[PDB]
Ligand binder design. Structure first.
Ligand SMILES: N[C@@H](CCC(=O)N[C@@H](CSSC[C@H](NC(=O)CC[C@H](N)C(=O)O)C(=O)NCC(=O)O)C(=O)NCC(=O)O)C(=O)O
Length: 92
């Protein structure tokens, strides 16, 4: 399955909204709370160049934060990035 991870901190309505969104999709994912783990969050920042939370990843891709995944969802793209169901229209 895809490796889906959302990095969060406490006191962050954007993080929890984003977590609830990912929970509503039924996907398997990890919420990683780095409120007090500055080294873990430094590794995350080195990759993305953002110092805010949440930061959401699917495999190697940084999808972005709360605004970005909500926008992707409104566009119908979020489901695709989370590796949800693939459809095929078979034509005779
Ligand atoms: N009370 C505020 C919002 C509620 C709230 O609790 N806000 C948070 C910050 S926004 S939540 C934390 C914030 N996230 C962001 O700003 C990410 C926004 C981006 N647009 C996205 O879509 O993800 C962030 O990372 N900031 C940078 C940093 O912390 O260094 C807070 O004040 N926490 C209190 C505390 O920390 O004690 C309001 O109504 O305006």
């Amino acid at each position: 399955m895809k490796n889906i991870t959302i990095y969060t901190k406490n006191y962050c309505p954007y993080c929890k909204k984003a977590v609830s969104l990912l929970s509503s999709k039924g996907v398997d994912f990890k919420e990683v709370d780095v409120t007090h783990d500055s080294k873990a969050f430094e590794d995350v920042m080195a990759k993305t160049g953002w110092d805010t939370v949440p930061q959401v990843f699917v495999d190697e891709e940084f999808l972005g934060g709360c605004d970005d995944i909500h926008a992707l969802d409104r566009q119908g793209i979020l489901d695709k990035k989370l590796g949800l169901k693939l459809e095929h229209h078979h034509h005779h």
